[PDB]
Design a protein around this ligand. Structure first.
Ligand SMILES: *[C@@]12=NC3=[C]C([C])=C([C])[C]=C3N([C][C]([O])[C]([O])[C]([O])[C]OP([O])([O])=O)C1=NC(=O)[N]C2=O
Length: 109
């Protein structure tokens, strides 16, 4: 298929830290698990990231909704890339959101 990466955020912690990342996520961003696990994904953002799109994800996460946005993101070396990002909430049977899962696609083409 098309090249994509996958992460899991723990929504039981208040700031959705990342608890699992696929090998391509590390390879695409230049960050190691030592710098990725335990942190909110937003460290990938930088000067040119559109706050109106960031705002859309902040809201959907607060509301436990799925969401899809394209964001400017930066590698560890500072270089930018366009990240089409889809977040999906994973609920327990009591309707509570337990995890968020992300699919990130570098769509710089
Ligand atoms: C990031 N991927 C990503 C994956 C998941 C599963 C979740 C829940 C969030 C992200 N983010 C965004 C970040 O964690 C946060 O949700 C937003 O920045 C909005 O909240 P704030 O408080 O910061 O306004 C991802 N952000 C990225 O920039 N790149 C991703 O790959």
């Amino acid at each position: 298929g098309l090249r994509h990466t996958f992460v899991v955020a723990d929504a039981t912690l208040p700031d959705c830290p990342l608890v699992y990342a696929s090998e391509g996520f590390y390879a695409m961003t230049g960050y190691g698990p030592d710098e990725v696990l335990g942190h909110n994904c937003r460290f990938l953002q930088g000067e040119g990231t559109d706050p109106k799109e960031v705002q859309k994800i902040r809201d959907a996460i607060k509301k436990g909704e799925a969401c899809s946005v394209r964001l400017l993101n930066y590698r560890k070396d500072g270089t930018p890339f366009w990240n089409l990002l889809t977040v999906t909430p994973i609920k327990t049977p009591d309707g509570r959101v337990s995890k968020f899962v992300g699919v990130q696609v570098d769509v710089t083409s």
